[PDB]
Write a protein that binds this DNA or RNA. Structure first.
Ligand SMILES: [Mg+2]
Ligand SMILES: [Mg+2]
Ligand SMILES: [Mg+2]
Ligand SMILES: [Mg+2]
Ligand SMILES: [Mg+2]
Ligand SMILES: [Mg+2]
Ligand SMILES: [Mg+2]
Ligand SMILES: [Mg+2]
Ligand SMILES: [Mg+2]
Ligand SMILES: [Mg+2]
Ligand SMILES: [Mg+2]
Ligand SMILES: [Mg+2]
Ligand SMILES: [Mg+2]
Ligand SMILES: [Mg+2]
Ligand SMILES: [Mg+2]
Ligand SMILES: [Mg+2]
Ligand SMILES: [Mg+2]
Ligand SMILES: [Mg+2]
Ligand SMILES: [Mg+2]
Ligand SMILES: [Mg+2]
Ligand SMILES: [Mg+2]
Ligand SMILES: [Mg+2]
Ligand SMILES: [Mg+2]
Ligand SMILES: [Mg+2]
Ligand SMILES: [Mg+2]
Ligand SMILES: [Mg+2]
Ligand SMILES: [Mg+2]
Ligand SMILES: [Mg+2]
Ligand SMILES: [Mg+2]
Ligand SMILES: [Mg+2]
Ligand SMILES: [Mg+2]
Ligand SMILES: [Mg+2]
Ligand SMILES: [Mg+2]
Ligand SMILES: [Mg+2]
Ligand SMILES: [Mg+2]
Ligand SMILES: [Mg+2]
Ligand SMILES: [Mg+2]
Ligand SMILES: [Mg+2]
Ligand SMILES: [Mg+2]
Ligand SMILES: [Mg+2]
Ligand SMILES: [Mg+2]
Ligand SMILES: [Mg+2]
Ligand SMILES: [Mg+2]
Ligand SMILES: [Mg+2]
Ligand SMILES: [Mg+2]
Ligand SMILES: [Mg+2]
Ligand SMILES: [Mg+2]
Ligand SMILES: [Mg+2]
Ligand SMILES: [Mg+2]
Ligand SMILES: [Mg+2]
Ligand SMILES: [Mg+2]
Ligand SMILES: [Mg+2]
Ligand SMILES: [Mg+2]
Ligand SMILES: [Mg+2]
Ligand SMILES: [Mg+2]
Ligand SMILES: [Mg+2]
Ligand SMILES: [Mg+2]
Ligand SMILES: [Mg+2]
Ligand SMILES: [Mg+2]
Ligand SMILES: [Mg+2]
Ligand SMILES: [Mg+2]
Ligand SMILES: [Mg+2]
Ligand SMILES: [Mg+2]
Ligand SMILES: [Mg+2]
Ligand SMILES: [Mg+2]
Ligand SMILES: [Mg+2]
Ligand SMILES: [Mg+2]
Ligand SMILES: [Mg+2]
Ligand SMILES: [Mg+2]
Ligand SMILES: [Mg+2]
Ligand SMILES: [Mg+2]
Ligand SMILES: [Mg+2]
Ligand SMILES: [Mg+2]
Ligand SMILES: [Mg+2]
Ligand SMILES: [Mg+2]
Ligand SMILES: [Mg+2]
Ligand SMILES: [Mg+2]
Ligand SMILES: [Mg+2]
Ligand SMILES: [Mg+2]
Ligand SMILES: [Mg+2]
Ligand SMILES: [Mg+2]
Ligand SMILES: [Mg+2]
Ligand SMILES: [Mg+2]
Ligand SMILES: [Mg+2]
Ligand SMILES: [Mg+2]
Ligand SMILES: [Mg+2]
Ligand SMILES: [Mg+2]
Ligand SMILES: [Mg+2]
Ligand SMILES: [Mg+2]
Ligand SMILES: [Mg+2]
Ligand SMILES: [Mg+2]
Ligand SMILES: [Mg+2]
Ligand SMILES: [Mg+2]
Ligand SMILES: [Mg+2]
Ligand SMILES: [Mg+2]
Ligand SMILES: [Mg+2]
Ligand SMILES: [Mg+2]
Ligand SMILES: [Mg+2]
Ligand SMILES: [Mg+2]
Ligand SMILES: [Mg+2]
Ligand SMILES: [Mg+2]
Ligand SMILES: [Mg+2]
Ligand SMILES: [Mg+2]
Ligand SMILES: [Mg+2]
Ligand SMILES: [Mg+2]
Ligand SMILES: [Mg+2]
Ligand SMILES: [Mg+2]
Ligand SMILES: [Mg+2]
Ligand SMILES: [Mg+2]
Ligand SMILES: [Mg+2]
Ligand SMILES: [Mg+2]
Ligand SMILES: [Mg+2]
Ligand SMILES: [Mg+2]
Ligand SMILES: [Mg+2]
Ligand SMILES: [Mg+2]
Ligand SMILES: [Mg+2]
Ligand SMILES: [Mg+2]
Ligand SMILES: [Mg+2]
Ligand SMILES: [Mg+2]
Ligand SMILES: [Mg+2]
Ligand SMILES: [Mg+2]
Ligand SMILES: [Mg+2]
Ligand SMILES: [Mg+2]
Ligand SMILES: [Mg+2]
Ligand SMILES: [Mg+2]
Ligand SMILES: [Mg+2]
Ligand SMILES: [Mg+2]
Ligand SMILES: [Mg+2]
Ligand SMILES: [Mg+2]
Ligand SMILES: [Mg+2]
Ligand SMILES: [Mg+2]
Ligand SMILES: [Mg+2]
Ligand SMILES: [Mg+2]
Ligand SMILES: [Mg+2]
Ligand SMILES: [Mg+2]
Ligand SMILES: [Mg+2]
Ligand SMILES: [Mg+2]
Ligand SMILES: [Mg+2]
Ligand SMILES: [Mg+2]
Ligand SMILES: [Mg+2]
Ligand SMILES: [Mg+2]
Ligand SMILES: [Mg+2]
Ligand SMILES: [Mg+2]
Ligand SMILES: [Mg+2]
Ligand SMILES: [Mg+2]
Ligand SMILES: [Mg+2]
Ligand SMILES: [Mg+2]
Ligand SMILES: [Mg+2]
Ligand SMILES: [Mg+2]
Ligand SMILES: [Mg+2]
Ligand SMILES: [Mg+2]
Ligand SMILES: [Mg+2]
Ligand SMILES: [Mg+2]
Ligand SMILES: [Mg+2]
Ligand SMILES: [Mg+2]
Ligand SMILES: [Mg+2]
Ligand SMILES: [Mg+2]
Ligand SMILES: [Mg+2]
Ligand SMILES: [Mg+2]
Ligand SMILES: [Mg+2]
Ligand SMILES: [Mg+2]
Ligand SMILES: [Mg+2]
Ligand SMILES: [Mg+2]
Ligand SMILES: [Mg+2]
Ligand SMILES: [Mg+2]
Ligand SMILES: [Mg+2]
Ligand SMILES: [Mg+2]
Ligand SMILES: [Mg+2]
Ligand SMILES: [Mg+2]
Ligand SMILES: [Mg+2]
Ligand SMILES: [Mg+2]
Ligand SMILES: [Mg+2]
Ligand SMILES: [Mg+2]
Ligand SMILES: [Mg+2]
Ligand SMILES: [Mg+2]
Ligand SMILES: [Mg+2]
Ligand SMILES: [Mg+2]
Ligand SMILES: [Mg+2]
Ligand SMILES: [Mg+2]
Ligand SMILES: [Mg+2]
Ligand SMILES: [Mg+2]
Ligand SMILES: [Mg+2]
Ligand SMILES: [Mg+2]
Ligand SMILES: [Mg+2]
Ligand SMILES: [Mg+2]
Ligand SMILES: [Mg+2]
Ligand SMILES: [Mg+2]
Ligand SMILES: [Mg+2]
Ligand SMILES: [Mg+2]
Ligand SMILES: [Mg+2]
Ligand SMILES: [Mg+2]
Ligand SMILES: [Mg+2]
Ligand SMILES: [Mg+2]
Ligand SMILES: [Mg+2]
Ligand SMILES: [Mg+2]
Ligand SMILES: [Mg+2]
Ligand SMILES: [Mg+2]
Ligand SMILES: [Mg+2]
Ligand SMILES: [Mg+2]
Ligand SMILES: [Mg+2]
Ligand SMILES: [Mg+2]
Ligand SMILES: [Mg+2]
Ligand SMILES: [Mg+2]
Ligand SMILES: [Mg+2]
Ligand SMILES: [Mg+2]
Ligand SMILES: [Mg+2]
Ligand SMILES: [Mg+2]
Ligand SMILES: [Mg+2]
Ligand SMILES: [Mg+2]
Ligand SMILES: [Mg+2]
Ligand SMILES: [Mg+2]
Ligand SMILES: [Mg+2]
Ligand SMILES: [Mg+2]
Ligand SMILES: [Mg+2]
Ligand SMILES: [Mg+2]
Ligand SMILES: [Mg+2]
Ligand SMILES: [Mg+2]
Ligand SMILES: [Mg+2]
Ligand SMILES: [Mg+2]
Ligand SMILES: [Mg+2]
Lengths: 124, 138
RNA sequence: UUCCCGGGCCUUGUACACACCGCCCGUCACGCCAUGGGAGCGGGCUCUACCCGAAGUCGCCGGGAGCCUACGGGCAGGCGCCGAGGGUAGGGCCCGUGACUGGGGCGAAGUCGUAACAAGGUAGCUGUACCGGAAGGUGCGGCUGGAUCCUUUCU
RNA sequence: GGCUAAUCCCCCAUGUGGACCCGCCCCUUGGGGUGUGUCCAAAGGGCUUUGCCCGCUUCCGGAUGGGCCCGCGUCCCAUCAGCUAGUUGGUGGGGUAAUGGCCCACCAAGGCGACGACGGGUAGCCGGUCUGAGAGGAUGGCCGGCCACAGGGGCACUGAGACACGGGCCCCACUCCUACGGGAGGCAGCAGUUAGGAAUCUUCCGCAAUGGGCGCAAGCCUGACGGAGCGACGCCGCUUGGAGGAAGAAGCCCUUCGGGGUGUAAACUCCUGAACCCGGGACGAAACCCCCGACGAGGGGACUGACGGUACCGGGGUAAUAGCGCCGGCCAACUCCGUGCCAGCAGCCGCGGUAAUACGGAGGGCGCGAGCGUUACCCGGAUUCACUGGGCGUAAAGGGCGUGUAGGCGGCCUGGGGCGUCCCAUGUGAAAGACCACGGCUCAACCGUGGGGGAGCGUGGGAUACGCUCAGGCUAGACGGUGGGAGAGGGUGGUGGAAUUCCCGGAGUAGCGGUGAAAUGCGCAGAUACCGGGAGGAACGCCGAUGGCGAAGGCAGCCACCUGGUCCACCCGUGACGCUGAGGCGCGAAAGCGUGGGGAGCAAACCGGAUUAGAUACCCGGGUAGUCCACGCCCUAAACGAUGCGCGCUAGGUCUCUGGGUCUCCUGGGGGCCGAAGCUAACGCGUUAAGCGCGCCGCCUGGGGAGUACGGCCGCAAGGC
């Protein structure tokens, strides 16, 4: 562009769209489970992935992932949405935080315990 | 009409030397004379003469280069390795004294036009003035 | 030595590279999903014209129609302008809901063909125009980003 | 309804002075002085009572705090392009501390806008903060400055000051009281409650300090404030021990079954002594006040803590919490077992379909550590909006072409101005912060004192190279004169031969045509092949090119007219008159549209004949729109050099078109091919740049969705932008 052209038109600052409307700019939203179901993943994999339809405090209905091995969630349980999505799944944009609300943590998990929300067991 | 005469000079020099021409003519202006005189004084050209081509005034710039070299490509190290415009018409650039560039870690120069005349960055600093930053050479 | 099969060397086009048993286009049906458009309703804000109009300041009256009076004036009271807001009729925006819906994703590549890539088997592409289950065909004009100098699908 | 005091209200006086009309003087927007005239003052109280105090009144200054006005800076969308009726000015007036359409009356017809008005969206602004090498991006909690609000909307009253958060009026919504007439509220003060939310504290102590209001004081008030409490929210300090201790226990893990590992780690020995107990125990506090002196200066005296028995000092004294992430690559850290596209992981690349360092546990290891991770968000990396610091032949990206409007840009010399530019001085740039230094809490965090720096803007002074401006010159650019050209450049008229089709006529007869093969079709009403004649429409063979012209689209027989561009020569005239160009306007192949003509050949559609599995096709026979003309629309394109225009500069070789020249050759202007330097991702480009540079315009920012939707504007439509 000529300089004069820059003085005329300028340069366009480019905005990014949020990968997450948990709205509020909030780190988490509380919601209620609607449907708690299983889903098959995208083309390169196969599995049965565990998900919930959640109706948020934020007005939105969204599908959230339920990480870890076991889970206790069912149609009316209230849950916490933490955001971050699931790649090989269709339209799952947020994860459920385990250990919070009616989400239990993951029973018997010894390893990365704070993800999955389980307490430190005692020893003998 | 050349839109920037001064650039046209600088470039005439650029292409000239990049083919190792021994001298080159540029249409004469007193200002160009000044710029030249700075280069000459600074060891960048050999010097220049006022001259006459088809009855129109030019300044003939005599160029210098390094020795011949060995291996493939014997071609000589340029003495003006780099020469470029800074102020141009349509973006004019003026530095105050504290804003006067140092060039190539001192090994180069910048030529500024000032109300004290045309001087090298060192010259201008010692004179304690700023002005229109014409070009840098190294 | 044309042809069929297998093969060697040179060259050429390629969108092929698990490499032509390669690649690949479009239409259809009923699920299910998340979008986008969207008449009609419901809420809001706004603007225009008209009508109503609190409080208050200002303006006038202030009168043998009230109070004070040193008769100079004062107060009360009244009336009017403006005026928050309200009403009627309208143009605009926004939110909600929403009949009806386009294109997409997943079913499964499922279905019909074989349109493009090798001269892709009618070189392709293109603006346009008509036409056809569908990729498409055809007319006109243009482009080279075109090979070389019977028809015969798919994997 | 009645009584009554005052530092409450009024009247007469005094007029230092001040205010107002008018005149003069000085000064210059309403500043200062002066003269006559009119108008305007007061309030008492206390005493250590003949003087001193706390006050009052008028005026002039000061200080401090404000009001109003101006230059400049201050987010996004032009899919917001026009907005404007007190609107723009004038006069007179109202209003105010004061200017002002601030308000009114009358007059005029203005004011604003692509330098983005109007409209929509969002938003308190700043000192600063975060990030970044910087430039820049992001931000404005806490602290300080400014503004604005005080349930929503209006309004004024009092007052030096308000249009007033704990003042007043009204309308509205809500809560509460009510005897249904009518009333009372307003935590965005401190606490606290409730709702909402992922989430944000004690209904604490104190008036001792600093500060604020009233009071002569003593004092009173002060959820300002000084403190304490809760929260790993942040930051900083510190603990969970220190030294010794095996060729190295058990356990566990690995194992080639030899051994390797956790590891001096433990056990154990010695030592120190977080916690905790005892004793002492602050600073922050000296004023106001009292006494002498004079209620001054000065000197002396007294009282006074929330924090708190806190910090701190002394003594005593116990070996005394460790956790979280990670170990496929980016990235520091590997093995066993389990699982077998499952269960699960996942930031991207991607792991899992029986030998998984990628899932899950374990052993081991790496990293941080009272934390460690995760989510969200900002800057970063991202030179991925490129000022620094990118690009557009084929990757995204040159507008289809021109004309020129605004705007950007401007050859050589001289002089004036000194606006841009640069310099010196000065003013400002508060404090806090950032920076450096010293210092104070045992360090630090935190804090204090000092110092430095600095953009910007104001004023004064100076410089004049460059940029501008004015003046005056020049001719190297540009245009003009004359002379010599070439050309399918354009518009209008005419007109020429070849061929096709049709008609007419002759002669002639059994087929012609067409294909891979055929058929449809045409032919005995006599076709095809041949001759003559007429009609008509379209297009111009050879020349013709590897050519020329044109801005592009495009432009081909000949003639005449009308007319545009352009190259060379002479070096004659003008004297910078220049380049580019958003917008506007004009042009713009084909197809398509409208009206009217025309219609020989061709030919979408269509009608048939074949081929095929089908054949809504390719092949064959027909054939309508259309193709042609006039006029008016349409505005597209592989509108391709996929390469904007102009100028200057950088080896050559060769072929060509068109000028000039002493005509091997040279010198211009176009078209081609190889190629120096150089560029380029390569391919390639290379004096016809894709090289080196300047000016200006257009455009690009991953693919799909999509040239789509919506909006607007064009268009008769189709459709275009
Ligand atoms: Mg897989
Ligand atoms: Mg339950
Ligand atoms: Mg993430
Ligand atoms: Mg893990
Ligand atoms: Mg400066
Ligand atoms: Mg063969
Ligand atoms: Mg051989
Ligand atoms: Mg060979
Ligand atoms: Mg080969
Ligand atoms: Mg095949
Ligand atoms: Mg709607
Ligand atoms: Mg609508
Ligand atoms: Mg009314
Ligand atoms: Mg008022
Ligand atoms: Mg009135
Ligand atoms: Mg009377
Ligand atoms: Mg009366
Ligand atoms: Mg009366
Ligand atoms: Mg009244
Ligand atoms: Mg009214
Ligand atoms: Mg109204
Ligand atoms: Mg898609
Ligand atoms: Mg579908
Ligand atoms: Mg398909
Ligand atoms: Mg085809
Ligand atoms: Mg094919
Ligand atoms: Mg083909
Ligand atoms: Mg075919
Ligand atoms: Mg064909
Ligand atoms: Mg067809
Ligand atoms: Mg076609
Ligand atoms: Mg064609
Ligand atoms: Mg392409
Ligand atoms: Mg091609
Ligand atoms: Mg060919
Ligand atoms: Mg075959
Ligand atoms: Mg198939
Ligand atoms: Mg009474
Ligand atoms: Mg009595
Ligand atoms: Mg009097
Ligand atoms: Mg007097
Ligand atoms: Mg006056
Ligand atoms: Mg008084
Ligand atoms: Mg009295
Ligand atoms: Mg002041
Ligand atoms: Mg009005
Ligand atoms: Mg008048
Ligand atoms: Mg006035
Ligand atoms: Mg008024
Ligand atoms: Mg007032
Ligand atoms: Mg009046
Ligand atoms: Mg009026
Ligand atoms: Mg302006
Ligand atoms: Mg708003
Ligand atoms: Mg706001
Ligand atoms: Mg903002
Ligand atoms: Mg940047
Ligand atoms: Mg900055
Ligand atoms: Mg800001
Ligand atoms: Mg706050
Ligand atoms: Mg606060
Ligand atoms: Mg503040
Ligand atoms: Mg308000
Ligand atoms: Mg409230
Ligand atoms: Mg309200
Ligand atoms: Mg209010
Ligand atoms: Mg007062
Ligand atoms: Mg207020
Ligand atoms: Mg209150
Ligand atoms: Mg108050
Ligand atoms: Mg009421
Ligand atoms: Mg009550
Ligand atoms: Mg209350
Ligand atoms: Mg009230
Ligand atoms: Mg509160
Ligand atoms: Mg709650
Ligand atoms: Mg607190
Ligand atoms: Mg208290
Ligand atoms: Mg106090
Ligand atoms: Mg005090
Ligand atoms: Mg006082
Ligand atoms: Mg006393
Ligand atoms: Mg008392
Ligand atoms: Mg009280
Ligand atoms: Mg406090
Ligand atoms: Mg907490
Ligand atoms: Mg906690
Ligand atoms: Mg710490
Ligand atoms: Mg020992
Ligand atoms: Mg020893
Ligand atoms: Mg050992
Ligand atoms: Mg052992
Ligand atoms: Mg063992
Ligand atoms: Mg062994
Ligand atoms: Mg062992
Ligand atoms: Mg030890
Ligand atoms: Mg021992
Ligand atoms: Mg001991
Ligand atoms: Mg103690
Ligand atoms: Mg003390
Ligand atoms: Mg003391
Ligand atoms: Mg006291
Ligand atoms: Mg005493
Ligand atoms: Mg005494
Ligand atoms: Mg005394
Ligand atoms: Mg004293
Ligand atoms: Mg004393
Ligand atoms: Mg105490
Ligand atoms: Mg005590
Ligand atoms: Mg002691
Ligand atoms: Mg001790
Ligand atoms: Mg121990
Ligand atoms: Mg020990
Ligand atoms: Mg550890
Ligand atoms: Mg790898
Ligand atoms: Mg790291
Ligand atoms: Mg590694
Ligand atoms: Mg399993
Ligand atoms: Mg196994
Ligand atoms: Mg395994
Ligand atoms: Mg495997
Ligand atoms: Mg493993
Ligand atoms: Mg991993
Ligand atoms: Mg693992
Ligand atoms: Mg471990
Ligand atoms: Mg560890
Ligand atoms: Mg953290
Ligand atoms: Mg943030
Ligand atoms: Mg970022
Ligand atoms: Mg950077
Ligand atoms: Mg980006
Ligand atoms: Mg880039
Ligand atoms: Mg740049
Ligand atoms: Mg780029
Ligand atoms: Mg370019
Ligand atoms: Mg090519
Ligand atoms: Mg391209
Ligand atoms: Mg072009
Ligand atoms: Mg032009
Ligand atoms: Mg101009
Ligand atoms: Mg000029
Ligand atoms: Mg000049
Ligand atoms: Mg100019
Ligand atoms: Mg001068
Ligand atoms: Mg100056
Ligand atoms: Mg000076
Ligand atoms: Mg200074
Ligand atoms: Mg200041
Ligand atoms: Mg300064
Ligand atoms: Mg400062
Ligand atoms: Mg500090
Ligand atoms: Mg610094
Ligand atoms: Mg220290
Ligand atoms: Mg600084
Ligand atoms: Mg600064
Ligand atoms: Mg000056
Ligand atoms: Mg001078
Ligand atoms: Mg002149
Ligand atoms: Mg002359
Ligand atoms: Mg002529
Ligand atoms: Mg001649
Ligand atoms: Mg012609
Ligand atoms: Mg002609
Ligand atoms: Mg005949
Ligand atoms: Mg006959
Ligand atoms: Mg027959
Ligand atoms: Mg026939
Ligand atoms: Mg027949
Ligand atoms: Mg027949
Ligand atoms: Mg017949
Ligand atoms: Mg017969
Ligand atoms: Mg007949
Ligand atoms: Mg016969
Ligand atoms: Mg004939
Ligand atoms: Mg005829
Ligand atoms: Mg005819
Ligand atoms: Mg004829
Ligand atoms: Mg013709
Ligand atoms: Mg040609
Ligand atoms: Mg063409
Ligand atoms: Mg002519
Ligand atoms: Mg001529
Ligand atoms: Mg001449
Ligand atoms: Mg002359
Ligand atoms: Mg000039
Ligand atoms: Mg234009
Ligand atoms: Mg015009
Ligand atoms: Mg056209
Ligand atoms: Mg046409
Ligand atoms: Mg037509
Ligand atoms: Mg007809
Ligand atoms: Mg057919
Ligand atoms: Mg077939
Ligand atoms: Mg079929
Ligand atoms: Mg058939
Ligand atoms: Mg045909
Ligand atoms: Mg026929
Ligand atoms: Mg035909
Ligand atoms: Mg028609
Ligand atoms: Mg039609
Ligand atoms: Mg040469
Ligand atoms: Mg000749
Ligand atoms: Mg040439
Ligand atoms: Mg080449
Ligand atoms: Mg080369
Ligand atoms: Mg380059
Ligand atoms: Mg190369
Ligand atoms: Mg040349
Ligand atoms: Mg040449
Ligand atoms: Mg060209
Ligand atoms: Mg060029
Ligand atoms: Mg290039
Ligand atoms: Mg980008
Ligand atoms: Mg995209
Ligand atoms: Mg389109
Ligand atoms: Mg729209
Ligand atoms: Mg539309
Ligand atoms: Mg338009
Ligand atoms: Mg229309
Ligand atoms: Mg179209």
């Amino acid at each position: 562009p000529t300089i004069n052209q820059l003085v005329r038109k300028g340069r366009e600052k480019v905005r990014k769209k949020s990968k997450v409307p948990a709205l509020k700019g909030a780190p988490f939203r509380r919601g209620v489970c609607t449907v708690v179901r299983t889903v098959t993943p995208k083309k390169p994999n196969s599995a049965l992935r565990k998900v919930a339809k959640v109706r948020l405090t934020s007005g939105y209905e969204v599908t959230a992932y339920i990480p870890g091995e076991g889970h206790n969630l069912q149609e009316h349980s209230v849950v916490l949405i933490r955001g971050g999505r699931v790649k090989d799944l269709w339209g799952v944009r947020y994860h459920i935080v385990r250990g919070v609300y009616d989400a239990a943590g993951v029973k018997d998990r010894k390893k990365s315990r704070s993800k999955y929300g389980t307490k430190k067991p005692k020893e003998a | 009409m050349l839109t920037d005469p001064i650039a046209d000079m600088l470039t005439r020099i650029r292409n000239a030397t990049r083919v190792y021409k021994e001298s080159t003519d540029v249409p004469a202006s007193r200002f160009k004379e000044e710029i030249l005189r700075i280069l000459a004084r600074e060891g960048f050209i050999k010097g220049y003469e006022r001259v006459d081509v088809d009855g129109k005034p030019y300044l003939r710039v005599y160029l210098k280069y390094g020795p011949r070299r060995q291996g493939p490509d014997p071609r000589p190290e340029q003495v003006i390795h780099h020469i470029r415009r800074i102020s141009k018409p349509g973006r004019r650039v003026y530095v105050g004294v504290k804003e006067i560039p140092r060039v190539r870690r001192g090994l180069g120069i910048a030529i500024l036009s000032t109300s004290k005349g045309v001087l090298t960055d060192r010259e201008a600093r010692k004179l304690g003035v700023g002005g229109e930053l014409i070009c840098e050479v190294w």
